[PDB]
């Protein structure tokens, strides 16, 4: 019935509300961390001193390619990995849903959900979408500190050097751009805080000298500027393009293009 | 008969990008446009970007609405006069920049009401009226003498105006010699051990600081008057600023 | 050619050099003494690049590439066609960047705002100089600097990287990265928070900054406030570039082997170095 | 069969981010001027860790050549799948480390590339 939902809907952690989707997410998030810790302790021979010295070297690898997209692999040969991915899939998606309903509850736009969705997009391509299009779980990313890095290094070399993948190049421009853009903005708002500049919502509803000086600073500098609201529209796009363009760039690696260097010499 | 899916996608992206930039640039034209001649008349040459369609903003606490883009509000005589017959040169103040409100001393005709918080109460309140705010930020300025860049005392700290919601001090209230009080922006004062130093203003410019009506609340318009004025002193109170500034 | 509120701000003063000589605009752009300075440096460099493209014989922007002197030159000069142009172009580039920053300072003065912007920009310049000046000078040769070419500089990143195995193992590189990612995540959230409040569900009033706080704390666990969030963004962004500079000024100057070997100091700690088992046992 | 030169030539592309194949005349058979790894021309039947120009050989690689390791298809295929594991076994040592930071997954490509090396990288 509704009483149960209502009961969960009032779940909290101090003054912050967790709600139904939040409880399912934290629970789902624990099982994930429990599946990886259980495998890590095993690899450490249940020895805490070994667990701490090799912490970064442990890795929960995916099923071998001979298993395709099946769920046959035994626990210690891809079984655990599959379980951990399931739980993580639910934790993330539950949290996404929580962000959508919470915005709805406070009567706000869904901008946060949309931006989050872009991050989820790259994650979905690395561990779910791409492996399925390649035909095997073995193509997915391992759960480990150093191992997922080794995975990243190998993925590039195998595909002809990702520096030649135009989408990896766009993704980078946007990553640097995000840093270039938060420095400018963060610095612009601090430079006019002496005029209440940080109160952006009020500067939008009733422009002040702080917002005008921010604009003129850049107009005189680079020839153009933005408004107190529009600046945040550049910000959200500059940041979501990082994972949008790159997800596309990885989804194209190995499925459409085998060697980016070669592809690049042709175009 | 096929095609390269990668060359297609990277081609589609740039189209999308060009389209995104157009959207973003027109979106940033809800304030300040149309452009004008240094005279005040439209420029006719507004550029390759057109103004967006009007959007209405419904202000909370029943403060009304706001539609942009629209008629440029900016209303108050600008005590500035041409310096050249050609465009692209400075406009020199005709009177007293500090008192006229131009240059780094400029302020904007904002709504003459205080900023409200979620509950509908004033966002900024004098600490000796706050709902239980104690001075634990470190050093307490209440009681200290305030001096200017001329190295002369202009008054003393009487109270602290705190921003309830964000919970931080935004103004230092200082009693001038004549007994009347003025508000000083926290970002414009340095609270020392035995005093408060204000490098943006000269002791004799403290009186010129715009005053607030209700002695318990400050409105947006009053905030711009004060801040624009205090900040303008960095440039205009320069001839009276003593060296060894630190 | 002015925004509807610009006029009252276009007063005289603020310049750091030349008094009123250059204190004027040109369209939307302010000039100032450092305005012509930037143009001077910028033009000369743009001309030396076009010249180098002639020596190289090609107008293809995808192929033009100005290379630094060959290692056999150390830190001395070099023929114009063999690195000399690279050295001159780097001077003009540093001059143009610096002038650009000083020109923002003048603009800050005239406007009565803080110096945070040119301060922040300076971090970017030090990172640039770290790759073309400090690091090369610490290693004994200009040849260690990267080349000026759209694609040749990416190859330089790749070769330098692999010179030390997988560069992912550089600890300062790991930290820089986490900052770049955390910055982008922060930027996304901030942008989305302001917008979701200014543009609520149709029919509703704009949301309050408290609604914004309420939602932000429901996501991260703590409320940071409007001033705190812009400070965090600038902080994250600057730290990223700080640690990047750091990860490179140390590579090939005090660390010479494959970066992964560095993590031995931790596996080889007294109390667990010899315990059998694990991955390194 | 048991190795395809043409498929080996294509698979060898991923190796060009670090290796090159340049004969003794100075002519490039394959490569983009990569210098991270040694020149592979003449590697077939060569003693591991001895390409005259490569100055970045590790100790494990060099001690394997000293123990008489000469490249053939058998050892070649094992090494490219995991340079470190391969060098640890062969050398006998346990803390032996390989400097090649790449792993060829498919054993088929290992044989194909080797067939490509015999076709263009054998020093007569
Ligand atoms: C330590 C980091 C490495 C490095 C690693 C990489 C990697 C990795 C990549 C790039 C990429 C790029 N790099 Mg780089 N790059 C370095 C230093 C530089 C310097 C410099 C003077 O220091 C410059 C001007 C560039 C410029 C560029 C751009 C051409 C390109 C994407 C823009 C970008 O990231 O914007 C961030 C800023 C913005 C988006 C804001 C607007 C800035 C505009 C876009 C810059 C114009 C650059 C212009 C074409 C060249 C100007 C020269 C003058 C005409 C003479 N790099 C250093 C040596 N660079 C990407 C690419 O696709 O390359 C082919 C890429 O993937
Ligand atoms: C040798 C290695 C290759 C290489 C191989 C790759 C590969 C392979 C990839 C990249 C990708 C990226 N590369 Mg690269 N890259 C190289 C060199 C570079 C250089 C450089 C100066 O050399 C730069 C600047 C970059 C930059 C980038 C970024 C633009 C991009 C990642 C976006 C991102 O951060 O998403 C961050 C966001 C996510 C990963 C989303 C997932 C997050 C999930 C949704 C949330 C988890 C919640 C969780 C439960 C809680 C866990 C908490 C933690 C335990 C703390 N690369 C070299 C040439 N690169 C990626 C790409 O294309 O991205 C688009 C990519 O796949
Ligand atoms: C394609 C790009 C690669 C990748 C390349 C890198 C690189 C390169 C680095 C990291 C690093 C990190 N990665 Mg990773 N990482 C990838 C995908 C992931 C995913 C995922 C899809 O779910 C997660 C949860 C992580 C999580 C992490 C964090 C533990 C760590 C700090 C970054 C940060 O700011 O976290 C903020 C977290 C919460 C706010 N990575 C993909 C597969 N990652 C850094 C590190 O130190 O790694 C050891 C690092 O240098
Ligand atoms: C195979 C290659 C190696 C590798 C090799 C290297 C090397 C080598 C370097 C990095 C560096 C970096 N790497 Mg790495 N890196 C690898 C993989 C990665 C991955 C990943 C997902 O795999 C990531 C996320 C990163 C991330 C990073 C960044 C932390 C760092 C970039 C510094 C920076 O942003 O300066 C940003 C700021 C600047 C570059 C300032 C310069 C800008 C100037 C001041 C302004 C330009 C003005 C312009 C001329 C005018 C524009 C035109 C006008 C508008 C018309 N690397 C792989 C493992 N990496 C670099 C670093 O730390 O550098 C210090 C570096 O040198
Ligand atoms: C914390 C540091 C971050 C940051 C901050 C930052 N950048 C800034 C600012 C700030 C605060 C500014 O105020 C300033 C700005 O005006 O706003 C856009 C700027 C700026 N950041 C820029 C670029 C930039 N920033 C970057 C990065 C970053 N900027 C960091 C992430 C990057 C990269 C690679 O990540 C780039 C490409 C410029 C657009 C702009 C400064 C404009 C400038 O300096 O102009 C000088 C003059 C010219 C127009 C001509 C230069 C022509 C020649 C003289 C030289 C070029 C030759 C050679 C050096 C280039 C070879 C290129 C090849 C490698 C392709
Ligand atoms: C535009 C892309 C960028 C981006 C955006 C982004 N990330 C986001 C969001 C947005 C808009 C959120 O709304 C969401 C968030 O709630 O943050 C406060 C989130 C988020 N980004 C996260 C991580 C993250 N984002 C990353 C990257 C990025 N996020 C990009 C740079 C990275 C990397 C690899 O760089 C990581 C590791 C999570 C902290 C958070 C989503 C939380 C989540 O899914 O939780 C589910 C699971 C649990 C509760 C498990 C807890 C485990 C046990 C300790 C208990
Ligand atoms: C709340 O405040 C703020 C504003 O105003 C309300 C602003 O405008 C800005 C400024 C930011 C923008 C207008 C967004 C667009 C800018 C970027 C994404 C940064 C990259 C910059 C460029 C491509 C322009 C480079 C141009 C130069 C250097 C001039 C040289 C000459 C060409 C003829 C910020 C940060 C801000 O915070
Ligand atoms: C591509 C699948 C590939 C092949 C094949 C390959 C082979 C190979 C051999 C046979 C050696 C030994 C050479 C000798 O003894 O003379 C060797 C050595 C190194 N390699 Fe390699 N290699 C391939 C790819 C790559 C890639 C992509 C890199 C760079 C990330 C790389 C690097 C190296 C290095 C370094 C060495 C020397 C190793 C040492 O001394 O331990 N290889 N490779
Ligand atoms: C693969 C799906 C990823 C979705 C990325 C969506 C980004 C949209 C972000 C909100 C855009 C807001 N707006 C109005 C300012 O443009
Ligand atoms: C208790 C150990 C905690 C291990 C945390 C491991 C984080 C590595 C994350 C990279 C794997 C990413 N993913 C989703 C693609 O699989
Ligand atoms: C909305 C922000 C506008 C940013 C525009 C950034 C352009 C940088 C382009 C880098 C060139 C990338 N590459 C490989 C595709 O050529
Ligand atoms: C009372 C609120 C007014 C804000 C005062 C700012 C205190 C932060 C001081 C550290 C920053 C110092 N500074 C000058 C180097 O930027
Ligand atoms: C509309 C296309 C005509 C382009 C006009 C641009 C002139 C600027 C040329 C500078 C770039 C020179 N080049 C070849 C070295 O790249
Ligand atoms: C020719 C002057 C030598 C100084 C070169 C330094 C340029 C960096 C300017 C950044 C401005 C920094 N700040 C906060 C002090 O104004
Ligand atoms: C006439 C071609 C149209 C011009 C397109 C613009 C290309 C930008 C070229 C600048 C490349 C400069 N360089 C040396 C750093 O590579
Ligand atoms: C995430 C990486 C941060 C780790 C910082 C490590 C600090 C411990 C440094 C001790 C290692 C000293 N050293 C030079 C001998 O290797
Ligand atoms: Cl919207
Ligand atoms: Fe903001
Ligand atoms: Na550790």
Distance of CA A152 to the CA centre of its chain: 16
8 Å CB contact between B172 and B156: no
Q: Nearest-CA neighbor of A198 among C189, C224, B95?
A: C224
Residues near A2 by beta carbon (within 8 Å), at least 6 away in sequence: none
What are chain B's domains? 5-109 (4.10.540.10), 110-242 (3.90.50.10)
In B, minimum Cα distance to C30 occurs at B88
Q: Provide the token pair at B136.
A: 């634990």
User: How far apart are the C-alpha atoms of B193 and B195, rounded to whole Å?
Assistant: 6
Cα separation, A121 vs A243, in Å, equals 7
For A109, counting Cβ atoms within 10 Å of its Cβ (0-12 exposed, 13-18 middle, 19+ buried), the class is buried
Does any CB of chain D come closer than 8 Å to the CB of residue A266? no
Compute CA A101 distance to the chain's CA centroid, rounded to the nearest angstrom. 20
Helical residues (DSSP H) of chain D, grouped into ranges:
5-11, 59-66, 73-81, 83-91, 107-120
Q: How many CA atoms lie within 13 A of A28 on its CB side?
A: 17
**CATH, range C164-263:** 1.20.85.10
Q: Tell me the backbone φ, ψ of residue A257, rounded to 5 degrees.
A: -120, 130
Regarding the beta carbon of A72 and ligand 5, being less than 6 Å apart is answered: no
- Strand partners for C106: none
The candidate with the shortest Cα–Cα distance to C198, out of D12, A200, A128, is: A200
Q: Contacts from C256-262 at CB under 8 Å and sequence distance 24+?
A: C257/C164, C258/C164, C258/C165, C258/C166, C258/C169, C258/D99, C258/D101, C259/C164, C259/C165, C259/C166, C259/C167, C259/C168, C259/C169, C259/C170, C259/C173, C260/C165, C260/C166, C260/C169, C261/D97, C262/C169, C262/C170, C262/C171
Compute the distance from residue C272 Cα to the ligand 16 centre, in Å: 17
CA-based nearest distance C160→chain D, Å: 9
Cβ count near B167 (within 10 Å): 11
Residue A122: CB within 6 Å of ligand 2?
yes
| Ligand 12, pocket-test mutation among B140, B166, B187, most atoms within 8 A of CB | B187
User: Which residue is closest in CA terms to ligand 15's atom 6?
Assistant: C61
**Beta carbons of A248 and B16 less than 8 angstroms apart:** no
- Tokens 């709805």 locate to A104
What 3-state class would DSSP assign to B174?
strand
Q: In the beta sheet, which residues pair with residue B116? A: B122
Query: In A170-184, which positions are buried (b, 16+ CB within 10 angstroms) versus exposed (e)?
Result: bbbebbebbbbbbbb
In terms of Cα–Cα distance, which of C121, C158, C163, C172 is closest to C139?
C163
Kindly tell me the burial class for residue C111, based on how many C-beta atoms sit within 10 Å of its own C-beta (0-12, 13-18, 19 or more). Answer: buried
Query: What distance in Å separates the CA atoms of residue A134 and residue B41, rounded to the nearest whole number?
Result: 63
The angle that helices A19-43 and A79-105 make with each other, rounded to 10 degrees, is 160
Q: Measured between alpha carbons, how far is D76 from D116 in angstroms, rounded to an integer?
A: 13
Nearest alpha-carbon partner for B102 in A212, A199, C35: A212
- Residues of D within 8 A of C162 (CB-CB) are 17-18, 36, 101
Residue B78, CB-side half-sphere exposure with 13 Å CA sphere: 24
Running DSSP on this structure, what letter comes out for residue D4?
-
Residue B55, CA distances (Å) to A109, B24, B52, C197, C199 in order: 15, 15, 9, 15, 10
Question: Phi/psi at A108 (nearest 5 deg)?
Answer: -115, 170
C262 Cβ neighbours under 8 A, 6+ residues apart: C169, C170, C171, C255
Strands A12-13 and A16-17: antiparallel
**C158 contact partners, CB below 8 Å, separation of at least 6:** A161, A163, D17
The helix or strand, by DSSP H or E, that contains position B171, with its residue range, turns out to be strand B168-175
* A84-107 burial code (b ≥16 CB/10 A, e <16): bbebbbbbbbbbbbbbbebbeebe
d(CA A258, CA A155): 11
Q: How far is A87 from chain D (nearest CA, A)?
A: 28
User: CB–CB of A217/A184 below 8 Å?
Assistant: no
Q: Rounded to an integer, what distance in angstroms lies between the CA atom of residue D66 and that of residue C236?
A: 51
Q: Where are the domains of chain D?
A: 1-124
Strands B181-185 and A12-13: unpaired
Chain C residues whose CB is inside 8 A of the A112 CB are 189, 192-193, 196, 215, 219
CA distance linking residue A132 with residue A139, whole number of Å: 9
Say whether residue B229 is in contact with chain C using an 8 A CB cutoff: no
Q: With CA atoms as reference, report the closest residue to C45 among C87, C98, C99.
A: C87
Count H helices and E strands in chain D, helices first: 5, 2
Detail the DSSP E strand segments found in B42-151: 55-59, 64-68, 80-81, 92-93, 124-126, 145-147
Reading the block at residue B88, the tokens are: 């692209």
- Using a CB–CB cutoff of 8 Å, tell me whether A110 touches chain C: yes
Cβ–Cβ < 8 Å for C247, C260 = no
Among C243, D77, A159, D79, smallest CA distance to D65 is for: D79
Ligand 10, atom 1, residue with closest C-alpha:
A37
Q: What is the rounded CA–CA span in Å between residue C52 and residue C66? A: 7
The whole-angstrom separation of Cα B165 and Cα C226 is 11
Are B126 and B161 in contact by the 8 Å Cβ rule? The answer is yes
Query: What torsion do the CA atoms of B67, B71, B73, B79 make, to the nearest 10 degrees?
Result: 160
The fourth-level CATH superfamily of domain C1-163 is Photosystem II protein D1-like (1.20.85.10)
Q: How far is CA D31 from the centre of its chain?
A: 14
Q: How far is Cα B194 from Cα B139, in angstroms, rounded to an integer?
A: 10
Distance in angstroms (rounded) separating the CA atoms of residues A142 and A62: 6
The architecture CATH gives domain D1-124: Orthogonal Bundle (1.10)
Experimental method used, please? X-ray
- Give the single-character DSSP code of B87: S
Name residues whose C-beta falls within 8 Å of residue A112's C-beta, 6 or more positions apart in sequence. Answer: A99, A103, C189, C192, C193, C196, C215, C219
Residues in the annotated binding site of A? 148, 168, 185, 200, 218, 232
Name residue B67's beta-bridge partners: B56
**Best residue of A165, A168, A196, A255 to probe chain B, by most B CBs closer than 10 Å:** A196
CA distance linking residue C84 with residue C37, whole number of Å: 22
Angle of CA points C210, C211, C214, to nearest 5° = 85
Q: CB distance from B231 to chain C under 8 Å?
A: yes
Which among A28, A178, A165 is positioned nearest to A118, based on CA atoms? A178
- Using a 10 angstrom Cβ sphere, with 0-12 exposed, 13-18 middle and 19 or more buried, the burial of residue C36 is middle
Distance of alpha carbon C275 from the chain centroid: 45
Q: Determine the Cα–Cα distance for residues B25 and A231; give it in Å rounded to an integer.
A: 10
Which has the closest alpha carbon to A106: B68, C233, C217? C217
Could you tell me the end-to-end alpha-carbon distance of chain A, in angstroms, rounded to an integer?
Answer: 60
Q: Are B145 and B198 in contact (CB under 8 A)?
A: no
Q: CB under 8 Å to C99, separation ≥6 — which residues?
A: C34, C37, C38, C41
Q: Are B169 and B162 in contact (CB under 8 A)?
A: yes
Interhelix angle C84-111/C116-129, rounded to 10 degrees, is 170
CA dihedral B116, B121, B125, B131 (to 10 degrees): -140
Per domain, the residue ranges of chain C are 1-163, 164-263
Q: Three-state DSSP class for D60?
A: helix
**Quick one: tokens of C115?**
């110096």
Closest CA to B6 of A50, C113, A164: A164
**Where do the H-state alpha helices sit in chain A?**
2-9, 19-43, 48-53, 79-105, 111-124, 130-134, 147-158, 166-191, 200-205, 209-222, 231-251, 260-266
**Alpha-carbon dihedral angle through residues A80, D110, A157, C168, given to the nearest 10 degrees:** 60
Do residues C67 and C84 touch, judged by C-beta distance below 8 A? no
Interface test with D, best of C156, C159, C162, C256 (most D CBs within 10 A): C162
B31 Cβ neighbours under 8 A, 6+ residues apart: A207, A211, A215, A227, A228, B68, B69, C3
Total Cβ atoms within 10 A of residue B57: 18
Q: How far is C37 from C98, CA to CA, in rounded Å? A: 10
Task: List CB contacts (< 8 A) between B66 and chain A.
Answer: 205-206
Q: Ligand 17 (ion): which residues have CB within 5 A? A: C 199
CA distance A63 to B108: 65
CA C141/CA C70 separation, integer angstroms: 8
With an 8 Å Cβ cutoff, are B9 and A170 in contact?
Answer: no
Answer whether the bond into residue B69 is a cis peptide, omega within 30°. yes
What is the distance between the alpha carbons of residues D49 and D59, in angstroms, rounded to a whole number?
A: 9
Q: Which of C163, C110, C101 is nearest to C129 (CA)?
A: C101
Measured CA distances, D68 to B223, D51, D65, D71, D78 (Å) = 84, 15, 5, 10, 16
As a whole number of angstroms, the distance between CA C60 and CA A67 comes to 49
- Reported as type and span, the H/E element at residue C53 is helix C33-55
Q: Which residue has the tokens 């004027």?
A: C24
Closest CA to A176 of C36, C54, D88, C177: C177
The CA angle C71-C73-C74, to the nearest 5 degrees, is 75
Query: Using CA atoms, how far apart are residues A120 and A124, in angstroms rounded to an integer?
Result: 6
Distance CA D39, CA D20 (A): 5
Q: Which domains does chain A have, with CATH numbers?
A: 1-109 (1.20.85.10), 110-267 (1.20.85.10)
In three-state secondary structure terms, B197 is strand
Contact C189 A43 (CB under 8 A): no
- The reply to whether A199 touches chain C by the CB within 8 Å rule is yes
What does each C-alpha distance from C70 to A118, A147, C85 come to in angstroms? 44, 37, 13
Half-sphere exposure of residue A118: CA atoms within 13 angstroms, side-chain side = 22
Long-range contacts of C103-107 (CB under 8 A, 24+ apart): C103/A221, C103/C30, C103/C32, C103/C34, C103/C35, C103/C37, C103/C38, C104/A217, C104/A221, C105/C16, C106/C14, C106/C15, C106/C16, C106/C30, C106/C32, C106/C33, C106/C34, C107/A217, C107/A220, C107/A221, C107/C14, C107/C30, C107/C32
How many Cα atoms within 13 Å fall on the side-chain side of residue C180?
Answer: 19
SS3 D22: strand
Of A112, B16, B17, B27, residue with least CA distance to C188: A112
- CB-side exposure of B80: number of CA atoms within 13 Å? 26
Cβ(A19)–Cβ(A98) below 8 Å: yes
Asked if B110 and B221 count as a contact pair (C-beta separation under 8 A), the reply is yes
SS3 content of chain C, % helix, strand, coil (to 5): 60, 5, 35
Q: List chain C residues with CB under 8 Å of D35.
A: 159
Q: What sign does the dihedral C178-C182-C184-C185 (CA atoms) show?
A: positive
Residues 6+ apart with CB under 8 A from C142: C68, C69, C73, C74, C75, C78, C83, C86, C87, C136
Cis previous bond, B223, omega within 30? no
Q: What is the number of alpha carbons within 13 Å of residue B48 lying toward its C-beta?
A: 5
B91 in Cβ contact with C11 (< 8 Å): yes
8 Å CB contact between C48 and C88: yes
Handedness of CA B146, B149, B151, B153 (dihedral sign): negative
Contact B236, B98 (CB under 8 A): yes
Whether D71 contacts D43, CB under 8 Å? yes
Half-sphere exposure of B153 (CA within 13 A, CB side): 11
Largest CA distance in chain A: 66
Tokens at residue C84, please?
């000399």
User: Is residue A229 a contact partner of residue C198, using CB atoms and an 8 Å limit?
Assistant: yes
């Amino acid at each position: 019935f509704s009483t149960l939902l209502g009961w969960f809907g009032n779940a909290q952690l101090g003054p912050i509300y967790l709600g139904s989707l939040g409880v399912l997410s934290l629970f789902s998030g624990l099982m994930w961390f429990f599946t990886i810790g259980i495998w890590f302790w095993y690899q450490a021979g249940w020895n805490p001193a070994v667990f701490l010295r090799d912490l970064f070297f442990f890795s929960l690898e995916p099923p071998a390619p001979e298993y395709g997209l099946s769920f046959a692999a035994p626990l210690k040969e891809g079984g655990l990995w599959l379980i951990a991915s399931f739980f993580m899939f639910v934790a993330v998606w539950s949290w996404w849903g929580r962000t959508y309903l919470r915005a709805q509850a406070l009567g706000m736009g869904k901008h946060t959900a949309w931006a989050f969705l872009s991050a989820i997009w790259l994650w979905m391509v690395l561990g779910f979408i791409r492996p399925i299009l390649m035909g095997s779980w073995s193509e997915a990313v391992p759960y480990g500190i150093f191992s997922h890095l080794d995975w990243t290094n190998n993925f590039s070399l195998v595909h002809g050097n990702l520096f030649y993948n135009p989408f990896h190049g766009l993704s980078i421009a946007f990553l640097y751009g995000s840093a270039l853009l938060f420095a400018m903005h963060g610095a612009t708002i601090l430079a006019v805080s002496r005029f209440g500049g940080e109160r952006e919502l009020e500067q939008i509803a009733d422009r002040g000298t702080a917002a005008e000086r921010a604009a003129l600073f850049w107009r005189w500098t680079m020839g153009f500027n933005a408004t107190m609201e529009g600046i945040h529209r550049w910000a959200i796009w500059m940041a979501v393009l990082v994972t949008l363009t790159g997800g596309i760039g990885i989804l194209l690696s190995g499925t459409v293009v085998d060697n980016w260097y070669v592809w690049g010499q042709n175009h | 008969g096929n095609f390269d899916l990668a060359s297609l996608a990277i081609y589609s992206f740039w189209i999308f990008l060009a389209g995104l930039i157009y959207y973003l640039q027109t979106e940033n034209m809800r304030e300040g446009y149309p452009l004008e001649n240094e005279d005040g008349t439209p420029a006719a040459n507004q550029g390759p970007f057109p103004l967006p369609k009007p959007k209405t903003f419904i202000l909370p606490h029943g403060r009304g609405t706001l539609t942009v883009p629209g008629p440029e509000s900016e209303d108050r005589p600008i005590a500035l006069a041409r310096t050249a017959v050609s465009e692209g040169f400075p406009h020199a103040p005709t009177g007293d920049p500090m008192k006229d409100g131009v240059g780094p001393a400029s302020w904007v005709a904002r709504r003459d009401l205080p900023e409200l918080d979620g509950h509908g109460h004033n966002k900024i309140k004098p600490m000796k009226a706050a709902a239980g705010f104690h001075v634990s930020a470190g050093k307490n300025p209440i009681g200290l003498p305030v001096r200017g860049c001329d190295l002369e005392i202009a008054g003393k700290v009487v109270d602290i105006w705190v921003d309830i919601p964000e919970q931080m001090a935004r103004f230092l209230e200082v009693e001038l010699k004549d007994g009347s009080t003025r508000l000083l922006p926290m970002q414009m004062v340095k609270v020392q051990s035995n005093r408060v130093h204000v490098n943006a203003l000269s002791s004799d410019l403290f009186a010129g600081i715009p005053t607030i009506k209700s002695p318990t609340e400050v409105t947006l318009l009053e905030e711009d008057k004060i801040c624009g004025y205090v900040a303008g002193g960095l440039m205009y109170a320069a001839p009276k600023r003593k060296s060894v500034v630190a | 050619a002015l925004l509807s509120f610009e006029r009252k701000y276009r007063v005289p003063g603020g310049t750091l050099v030349g008094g009123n000589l250059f204190d004027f605009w040109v369209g939307p752009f302010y000039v100032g003494f450092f305005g012509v300075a930037t143009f001077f440096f910028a033009a000369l460099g743009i001309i030396l690049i076009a010249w180098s493209a002639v020596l190289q014989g090609t107008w293809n922007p995808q192929l033009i590439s100005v290379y630094p002197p060959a290692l056999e030159y150390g830190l001395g000069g070099a023929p114009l066609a063999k690195g000399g142009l690279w050295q001159i172009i780097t001077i003009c580039a540093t001059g143009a960047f610096v002038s650009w920053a000083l020109r923002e300072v003048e603009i800050c003065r005239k406007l009565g705002i803080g110096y945070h912007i040119p301060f922040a920009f300076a971090f970017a310049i030090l990172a640039y100089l770290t790759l073309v000046l400090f690091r090369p000078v610490m290693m004994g040769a200009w040849g260690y600097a990267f080349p000026y070419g759209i694609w040749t500089h990416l190859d330089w990143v790749s070769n330098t990287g692999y010179t030390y195995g997988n560069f992912h193992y550089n600890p300062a590189h790991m930290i820089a990265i986490s900052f770049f990612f955390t910055n982008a995540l922060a930027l996304a959230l901030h942008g989305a928070l302001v917008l979701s409040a200014a543009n609520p569900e149709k029919g509703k009033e704009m949301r309050t900054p408290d609604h914004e706080d309420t939602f932000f704390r429901d996501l991260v666990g703590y409320s940071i406030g409007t001033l705190g969030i812009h400070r965090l963004g600038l902080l994250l962004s600057l730290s990223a570039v700080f640690f990047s500079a750091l990860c490179m000024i140390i590579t090939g100057t005090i660390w010479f082997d494959q970066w992964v070997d560095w993590w031995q100091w931790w596996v080889k700690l007294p109390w667990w170095a010899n315990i059998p088992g694990g991955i390194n046992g | 069969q048991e190795g395809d030169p043409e498929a080996g030539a294509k698979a060898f592309n991923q190796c060009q981010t670090c290796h090159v194949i340049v004969d003794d005349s100075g002519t490039t058979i394959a490569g983009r001027n990569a210098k991270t790894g040694p020149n592979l021309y003449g590697v077939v039947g060569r003693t591991a860790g001895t390409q005259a120009d490569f100055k970045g050989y590790g100790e494990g690689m060099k001690e394997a050549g000293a123990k008489g390791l000469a490249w053939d298809e058998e050892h070649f295929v094992q090494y490219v799948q995991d340079p470190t594991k391969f060098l640890k076994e062969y050398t006998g040592d346990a803390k032996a480390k390989g400097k090649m930071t790449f792993k060829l997954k498919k054993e088929a490509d290992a044989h194909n590339i080797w067939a490509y090396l015999q076709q263009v990288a054998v020093r007569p």
